[PDB]
Amino acid sequence: VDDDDKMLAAEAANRDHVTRCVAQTGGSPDLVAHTAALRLYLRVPHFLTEWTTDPDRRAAVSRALALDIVSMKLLDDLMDDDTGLDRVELACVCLRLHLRALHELESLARDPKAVTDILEQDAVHLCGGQIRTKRSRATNLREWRAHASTYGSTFLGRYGALAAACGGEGQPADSVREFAEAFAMTITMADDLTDYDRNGERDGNLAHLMRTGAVAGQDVVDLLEELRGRALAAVAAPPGAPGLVPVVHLYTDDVLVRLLPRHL
Amino acid sequence: DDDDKMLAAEAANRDHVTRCVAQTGGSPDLVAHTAALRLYLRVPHFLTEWTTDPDRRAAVSRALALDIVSMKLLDDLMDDDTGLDRVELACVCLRLHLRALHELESLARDPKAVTDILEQDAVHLCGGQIRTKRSRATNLREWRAHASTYGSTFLGRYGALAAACGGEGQPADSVREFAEAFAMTITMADDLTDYDRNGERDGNLAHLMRTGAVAGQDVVDLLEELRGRALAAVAAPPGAPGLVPVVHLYTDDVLVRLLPRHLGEAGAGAMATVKFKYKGEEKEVDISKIKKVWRVGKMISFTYDEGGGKTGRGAVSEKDAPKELLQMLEKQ
Ligand SMILES: CCCCCCCCCCO[C@@H]1O[C@H](CO)[C@@H](O[C@H]2O[C@H](CO)[C@@H](O)[C@H](O)[C@H]2O)[C@H](O)[C@H]1O
Ligand SMILES: CCCCCCCCCCO[C@@H]1O[C@H](CO)[C@@H](O[C@H]2O[C@H](CO)[C@@H](O)[C@H](O)[C@H]2O)[C@H](O)[C@H]1O
Numbered sequence: 001v002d003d004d005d006k007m008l009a010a011e012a013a014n015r016d017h018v019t020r021c022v023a024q025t026g027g028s029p030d031l032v033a034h035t036a037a038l039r040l041y042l043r044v045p046h047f048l049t050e051w052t053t054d055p056d057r058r059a060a061v062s063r064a065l066a067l068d069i070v071s072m073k074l075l076d077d078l079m080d081d082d083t084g085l086d087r088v089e090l091a092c093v094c095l096r097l098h099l100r101a102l103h104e105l106e107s108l109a110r111d112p113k114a115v116t117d118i119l120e121q122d123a124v125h126l127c128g129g130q131i132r133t134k135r136s137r138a139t140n141l142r143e144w145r146a147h148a149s150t151y152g153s154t155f156l157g158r159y160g161a162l163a164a165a166c167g168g169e170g171q172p173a174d175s176v177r178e179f180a181e182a183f184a185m186t187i188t189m190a191d192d193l194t195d196y197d198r199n200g201e202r203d204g205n206l207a208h209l210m211r212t213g214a215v216a217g218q219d220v221v222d223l224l225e226e227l228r229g230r231a232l233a234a235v236a237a238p239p240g241a242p243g244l245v246p247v248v249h250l251y252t253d254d255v256l257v258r259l260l261p262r263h264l
Numbered sequence: 265d266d267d268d269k270m271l272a273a274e275a276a277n278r279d280h281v282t283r284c285v286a287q288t289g290g291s292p293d294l295v296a297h298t299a300a301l302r303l304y305l306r307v308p309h310f311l312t313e314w315t316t317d318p319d320r321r322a323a324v325s326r327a328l329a330l331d332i333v334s335m336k337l338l339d340d341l342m343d344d345d346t347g348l349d350r351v352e353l354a355c356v357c358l359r360l361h362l363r364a365l366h367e368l369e370s371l372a373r374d375p376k377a378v379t380d381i382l383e384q385d386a387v388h389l390c391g392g393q394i395r396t397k398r399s400r401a402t403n404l405r406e407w408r409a410h411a412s413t414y415g416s417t418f419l420g421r422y423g424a425l426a427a428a429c430g431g432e433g434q435p436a437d438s439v440r441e442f443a444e445a446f447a448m449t450i451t452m453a454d455d456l457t458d459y460d461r462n463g464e465r466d467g468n469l470a471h472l473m474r475t476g477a478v479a480g481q482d483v484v485d486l487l488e489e490l491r492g493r494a495l496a497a498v499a500a501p502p503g504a505p506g507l508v509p510v511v512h513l514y515t516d517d518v519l520v521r522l523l524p525r526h527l528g529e530a531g532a533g534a535m536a537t538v539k540f541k542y543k544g545e546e547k548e549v550d551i552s553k554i555k556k557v558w559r560v561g562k563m564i565s566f567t568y569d570e571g572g573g574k575t576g577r578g579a580v581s582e583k584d585a586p587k588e589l590l591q592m593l594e595k596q
């Protein structure tokens with residue numbers, strides 16, 4: 001019925017698609033549960049596919065994306081080697097999800113070629129940015145936003161792009177992406193402001209900068225409002241994706257109301 | 265000159281790969297690490313041998329390299345023993361891979377060709393790598409099975425892609441039957457080549473053999489079976505004749521260089537023997553029991569070792585002489 005019902009049912013669809021795949025490739029119970037806990041990553045393909053009208057195609061695209069996004073997160077876990085999962089399972093499963101994603105994605109694009117074009121377009125900016133990020137810590141909001149604009153904006157924006165290519169009409173590609181890129185920074189900040197109490201982890205960068213006073217409350221607030229506005233702007237372009245308006249709001253207020261206080 | 269094309273191809277592939285790794289933030293370490301993947305940068309050359317256009321062959325050969333290197337980089341990441349930076353490893357892996365997909369698809373006979381191929385058996389490859397790295401094989405049957413995934417399977421996909429992007433006249437299944445045959449030969453070579461690095465202690469097949477759990481003659485047989493298989497696939501019309509010496513070169517390298525390091529005294533096992541009929545009796549003598557041997561026309565005359573000091577004697581037609589006794593002739 002309501003929209004929260006579709007999101008919830010999409011998340012489930014995607015989680016199940018992902019796990020069937022993880023298990024039928026040899027991944028273990030640990031790994032299958034690991035991937036099933038990737039809550040927001042399994043839900044975001046839903047948002048990126050809001051412009052897609054056919055529900056059949058929407059579902060298909062939605063999960064092909066969940067597959068690749070899960071894959072990239074597995075790789076990120078592989079490089080950091082801190083989750084306690086088996087590196088072999090991690091590398092092998094990761095690769096297998098990605099290959100299924102390409103395949104399913106290309107089976108849905110107008111032009112199969114569009115998928116690799118997109119993934120290539122800024123592969124250097126993303127992988128290059130992922131290294132530099134992990135290399136040096138940022139020391140102010142400006143460095144933070146730049147660092148974040150890669151493992152966040154660039155990373156999620158490619159999927160907005162793919163989502164627009166595997167969806168057909170009723171799709172304004174630039175805007176879908178503009179949306180993915182703003183929403184990403186928002187959730188990135190949140191993830192950077194949440195600490196979940198795991199081994200040798202400590203405090204999110206941005207969180208740290210906030211506590212050292214090196215980054216000000218109002219500026220983080222400013223930023224959040226900039227991203228909110230930018231997201232709303234993108235779901236308004238024709239033909240809009242009105243459904244994302246409450247979503248934009250939900251996650252943005254969430255950081256404002258819930259998370260920020262812990263640091264101010 | 266085909267050894268000249270080869271060398272030139274490997275340098276080209278090598279530069280393509282180090283431009284990428286460096287342009288993406290890979291450090292000197294890593295750039296140096298990818299430059300050292302010899303066979304991996306050279307093998308794309310053999311896969312494109314059926315390619316008639318030199319520009320296309322070039323492009324496919326170097327794009328195949330990006331991916332193959334990218335795959336080995338991921339394997340180095342799962343093992344975490346290179347001492348290289350995990351991040352850079354991961355990042356660079358993905359960048360090459362993406363470039364690889366883009367390049368291969370720009371040359372493909374069909375837009376779904378590349379992902380069709382990478383997908384066909386992603387499970388067989390991936391689930392297999394996990395099986396392999398989990399249980400050590402414990403006889404040849406097991407060794408051949410494991411090997412046939414990170415080896416035959418892994419490469420065959422590239423053989424298949426090579427044909428998908430090699431313009432016209434590519435006998436697909438053969439290009440690929442070659443990749444899989446040849447891959448296993450090379451995998452045996454790597455399991456028996458000892459590089460003496462951080463835990464790169466003793467190849468499973470090398471171990472197995474030292475443990476006598478695997479029979480030299482059985483390992484010679486397989487090489488021979490693999491050789492035949494590769495030669496046949498290179499013969500299918502329109503054939504890739506130039507790969508024939510390539511096949512022999514690698515197969516023989518294992519037979520002649522690597523095998524001995526692990527068998528030792530005798531490779532075959534069927535210890536050579538001579539059969540004759542001295543003094544009414546039927547006799548057989550080990551070629552290791554032989555002392556002296558000479559030729560008198562088309563007969564072979566010789567002496568051997570019997571009960572302690574006691575000397576034995578015999579003469580056989582050179583047509584009845586084991587290849588191993590005749591070698592003593594042209595040695596004596
Ligand atoms: C989507 C594109 C944008 C990228 C930005 C990141 C988006 C996700 C925001 C928060 O993500 C969470 O990160 C946690 C920490 O990294 C994970 O919990 C981790 O720590 C918890 C600690 O309680 C454990 O329970 C979990 O098993 C373990 O996965 C959790 O799975 C994941 O949902
Ligand atoms: C080769 C590219 C492969 C794709 C990589 C991106 C895929 C999407 C995963 C994003 O996951 C987030 O990645 C951040 C960085 O990886 C982590 O932040 C952690 O690390 C950041 C940079 O190292 C710091 O800014 C944060 O404070 C710290 O919490 C964060 O927890 C994690 O949930």
Ligand SMILES: CCCCCCCCCCO[C@@H]1O[C@H](CO)[C@@H](O[C@H]2O[C@H](CO)[C@@H](O)[C@H](O)[C@H]2O)[C@H](O)[C@H]1O
Pocket residue numbers: 296297298300301302303304307414415418419447450451454459460461464
């Ligand atoms: C290809 C189809 C079938 C797949 C199986 C792969 C076939 C194996 C061929 C030989 O592999 C060699 O193994 C070495 C292992 O040591 C590599 O050096 C690696 O290790 C060296 C130390 O031993 C370092 O100096 C190098 O940087 C590092 O690349 C070397 O370059 C590589 O050619």
Ligand SMILES: CCCCCCCCCCO[C@@H]1O[C@H](CO)[C@@H](O[C@H]2O[C@H](CO)[C@@H](O)[C@H](O)[C@H]2O)[C@H](O)[C@H]1O
Pocket residue numbers: 091092095335336338339389390393396397398414418454455466467468469
């Ligand atoms: C998800 C799949 C993606 C990666 C696909 C692999 C791409 C090419 C990798 C092949 O490289 C070889 O891999 C073997 C196995 O990884 C290694 O053997 C080592 O490990 C084997 C199994 O763990 C044993 O059979 C051998 O004895 C031992 O030398 C070998 O040295 C290494 O050069």
